[PDB]
Write a protein that binds this ligand. Structure first.
Ligand SMILES: O=P(O)(O)O[C@H]1[C@H](O)[C@@H](OP(=O)(O)O)[C@H](OP(=O)(O)O)[C@@H](OP(=O)(O)O)[C@H]1O
Ligand SMILES: O=P(O)(O)O[C@H]1[C@H](O)[C@@H](OP(=O)(O)O)[C@H](OP(=O)(O)O)[C@@H](OP(=O)(O)O)[C@H]1O
Ligand SMILES: [Cl-]
Lengths: 315, 315
């Protein structure tokens, strides 16, 4: 027919939340290193591209605007690691430093240990509104206080392996941990592995509009790869609209992020469900760039969700 | 001074239940074999003793009373394995066959899979009365229905390793499963690793008293070793009081059970806590033998718990 059930950029809406409910408190960071994993800032030197993306290692992207961009990204962290990050970022700016938490999955800290309520594909909060996801999170964190919990790292086949059991004496939300490290906090509940929703992006752009000139944004997700890079890319496009799409994509990849341009996708058989979500992200990244280019001149009078509905992306 | 806080036979009462709360649905049997592990009956041939017990391999225990004993023991089982056990036992008797469940830990069947709510040392119900342990079990099993659960086998260090996640469509208690296999059901909530309590034994003795002559008792615990052998030994002593302690202990061991007499206890560093519980069971097995010998003449008018308080065991 002519009516589409889920438009491009919303494929995840077709999945059934009940088939991915949370079943374990996953260890988000073992706390052994001084900093979170995949830590990088926009002032960093560009490195050779990762071979899996089949890029031109000889291409030198423009760094126009990177010194003033003021953003960084990383994986999840322990409280001590976030204090190290905050201290490092303070050496680069006198503006407010934001911990921009991009995780939809319920997470927090049990006795200072960074944990998340993990469901298959990390989709324990799939389908929930940001309100419902945050309510789940608060309820779960609180329920763990003075209770025995099993906290484990995921091993072979994304299933618990080893870990530890403890009776919890202290519970904190990431907001509390960010404030204790001297950072401002802003939450965007984005689903792991997929393109952020129009709701997620409209929320980010509204937040972006409120920032003072010297604000520094430290984005993070679980690994500091998929969601973190998507938002770092969006920020680079918004702040440096005259830079080419290719340069934005190459430079965000070359300072240590994911590469959001076209590349030959290949997954292990067990990860084949990811293929179309990668393809969806490549197309949406181009569509967001188009949104920025067509709406920056009038100051974004119309939001991303609205413009995308009248300018749908195509596979 | 004079007053003793915990008498011999009750050491476990000094442990703190809050430090061993349940944290995972442990897989009790993977269902691969036709029968549960350590399956054996009193009609079986005696085999050579296990080396670790340092026994006399040349010794020939008396079998006096074994053919009429009518008892068996095994590990936990899937419903299909229990049906196989019941069919096997029916070839040996025309009397009622009892599934004597000796597990204090909460356990049952989720989608037919035998599971238990596991806490450190398998002590998730330590300290609870049987009434409280069964209420915990009934609430946990029921709460699992239509919910997502993580079921895993324990691997390295008694922590989950691998396993599976499933949204449960069927929940059953072992009572339901035993009845489906054509067995009567009798529960004694005995704590894993330790000597059965005076309450556990008083309950068993009262049940034993009213059994029809041709009743067949199939005992089981998790592995079919510690608790299963303790009750098989007690039944053998009760039913065959003229048989020597040495013969009872050797023969229950030689048909496939644990050896409940003195031996060179040698544990790994991580299992050193077990040492005193072994020593306690050796002493209590002797004390129970004394009880049977001294109370059989009047038909056991004095319960085990009462008699033990007036004749305490000595370390
Ligand atoms: O949290 P963000 O920073 O968004 O990054 C995600 C998480 O690290 C994912 O692991 P998890 O779901 O266990 O938290 C990982 O999936 P895998 O571990 O399956 O590789 C993703 O890579 P890909 O899904 O491969 O693209 C990566 O993009
Ligand atoms: O269930 P019953 O038949 O009473 O047997 C018990 C359980 O199998 C215990 O394992 P679990 O705690 O995992 O249920 C096992 O401890 P280990 O598995 O640590 O060896 C005991 O041996 P010992 O504790 O070694 O005596 C054994 O006697
Ligand atoms: Cl009781």
């Amino acid at each position: 027919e002519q009516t589409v059930t889920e438009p491009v950029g919303s494929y995840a809406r077709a999945e059934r939340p009940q088939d991915f409910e949370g079943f374990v408190w996953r260890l988000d960071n073992d706390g052994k290193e001084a900093l979170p994993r995949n830590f990088r800032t926009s002032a960093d030197a560009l490195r050779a591209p990762e071979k899996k993306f089949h890029l031109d290692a000889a291409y030198v992207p423009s760094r126009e605007g990177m010194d003033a961009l003021h953003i960084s990204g990383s994986s999840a962290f322990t409280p001590a690691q976030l204090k190290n990050v905050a201290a490092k970022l303070r050496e680069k700016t006198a503006g407010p430093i934001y911990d921009v938490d991009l995780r939809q999955e319920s997470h927090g800290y049990l006795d200072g240990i960074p944990v998340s309520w993990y469901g298959e594909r990390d989709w324990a909060n799939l389908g929930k509104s940001q309100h419902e996801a945050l309510a789940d999170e608060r309820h779960r964190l609180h329920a763990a206080l003075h209770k025995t919990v099993y906290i484990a790292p995921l091993g072979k086949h994304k299933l618990p392996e080893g870990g530890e059991v403890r009776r919890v004496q202290k519970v904190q939300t990431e907001q509390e941990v960010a404030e204790a490290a001297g950072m401002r906090y802003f939450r965007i509940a984005a689903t792991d592995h997929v393109w952020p929703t129009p709701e997620n992006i409209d929320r980010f752009l509204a937040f972006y509009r409120t920032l003072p000139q010297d604000a520094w944004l430290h984005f993070h997700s679980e690994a500091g790869v998929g969601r973190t890079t998507a938002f770092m890319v969006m920020t680079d496009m918004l702040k440096n609209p005259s830079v080419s799409l290719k340069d934005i994509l190459y430079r965000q990849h070359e300072i240590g992020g994911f590469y959001y341009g076209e590349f030959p996708i290949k997954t292990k058989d067990k990860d084949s469900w990811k293929t179309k979500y990668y393809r969806e992200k490549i197309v949406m990244i181009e569509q967001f760039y188009r949104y920025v280019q067509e709406n920056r001149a009038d100051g974004y009078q119309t939001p991303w969700s609205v413009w995308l509905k009248s300018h749908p992306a195509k596979a």
